[model samples]
Target: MAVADLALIPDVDIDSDGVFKYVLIRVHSAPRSGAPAAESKEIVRGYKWAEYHADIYDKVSGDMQKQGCDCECLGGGRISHQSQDKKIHVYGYSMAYGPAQHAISTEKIKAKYPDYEVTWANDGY
Candidate 1:
């Protein structure tokens, strides 16, 4: 599934029953320039659900569609990492066209997790 291409909420949702409050998304990577069978995923988390509209998935999902990801796919959850000495990391995946257009994905995610840095895997906002 396309959702399997990327995953968020690695572990239990601390506030599963509460309003949404986090997001993670993909931006760049070495793999994107390679084979189509290969996939790169990113995510954004630990933010405020209210900060985003209820339909935020529409935007993310649409982007995934462009990448040829299946509509049934989702940010597969069970995310549980973020060392005490380091900042949290999240990941998501999206595709880029000629130039600059991919950034639209970043804006959608970064807006939620404003204070963060990027890492190699299971990494940043």
Candidate 2:
């Protein structure tokens, strides 16, 4: 899958002070149900999938830190596709202190895509 397809999306807006309380990432899995693959093959497939996600998370986290953001990325949970399309879902969260924190986090993101816009605000407002 492409990085754009698996990138993190903040769930809540950051505070006016520039802190992001939380962020979420939605992962989309390709359908693979009732395939003729062997059990060993399936295991290898799963392992690779997991490794890919982990690597992406690490890279994103490092990028965020380099941009001066105080944030931590964490795996949230997995969910099955409601459409029964033989796909799986994974969610990730990025927690930060406030709005400035979110700006730093977004700065890293914008470094990769200069045209990208990140707008967030505290829910308490």
Candidate 3:
């Protein structure tokens, strides 16, 4: 990002009500106290690529479900949104790199998925 003239990385997410949206992420000059934009989201296009991506997204979510990740919409298997690049799956994030682990508690878990049995853990420090 420091050496490039322009860089654009797009992202996607399944909203709370289950809809896909395009999220554009970029890095550029920033000398102020904080990030310039809170968010720059766009409603996804309505064309062939729309169904293509939606199908892939459904497949990923289904795989998770078959693997017993079926608790709720915001299930226990939450992580950076998935994408395709070359021949493998990739995730998009704001941070350049990390597992980006944050502390978790059973309380928060119960609130998020009230009917499910929730457990939390930490690793890979």
Candidate 4:
């Protein structure tokens, strides 16, 4: 269910100077309570909020990579084996401007996965 090695990028305009870094998506696969113990999916979809953000990351990363902009994982979603309900259900790249990248990234992901939910946050790492 979870998309492994997933990295969703933001829709921010790539720096004209050749630099782009936005972790719009912070996702990790995990074993669901009802699924096979060894099974995992892009469980971000499990959360009521993360669905769209994950899609945004998927879209942004794809677009940026196509334009030659670099999409880097600044760090997050590494220890997914810790919890199922406690997993990351918030947007990535916390910022001072009220979850800066949340909207930008949501729009991108929603563009692709239209059914995904769009969520934003100002805190949480």
| Candidate that would win on lDDT | 1
How accurate locally is residue 35 in candidate 3, as Cα lDDT from 0 to 100?
A: 29
- A best-first ranking of the candidates according to their lDDT comes to 1, 4, 2, 3
Residue 13, candidate 4: C-alpha displacement in angstroms: 16
Mind giving the per-residue lDDT tens digits that candidate 1 earns over 52-84?
A: 422334455465555444222233211223545
Candidate 1, which segments miss by more than 4 Å at Cα? 1-20, 25-36, 45-54, 70-125
Report the error of model 2 at residue 84, Å: 2.4
Local accuracy of candidate 3 as per-residue lDDT tens digits, 1-125: 12211113212223322222211212222212242423221211111233433343354445333332211112112222223322111122212232212122233323444334433333321
As a TM-score, model 2 comes out at: 0.24
Better of 1 and 3 by lDDT: 1
Residue 96 error for model 4, in Å? 15
Q: Write the per-residue lDDT of candidate 4 for residues 1-125, one digit (tens) a residue.
A: 43222233222222111112234333322223232333211211112223333443556446434533324332222112113332222333423122333454545544544433544454545
Give TM per candidate. Answer: 0.25, 0.24, 0.19, 0.28
Stretches off by above 4 angstroms in model 3 are 1-95
When summed lDDT is taken over every stretch of 10 residues in candidate 1, the lowest stretch is 93-102
Ranking by TM-score: 4, 1, 2, 3
Give the best candidate by TM-score: 4
Between candidates 2 and 4, which one is better according to lDDT?
Answer: 4
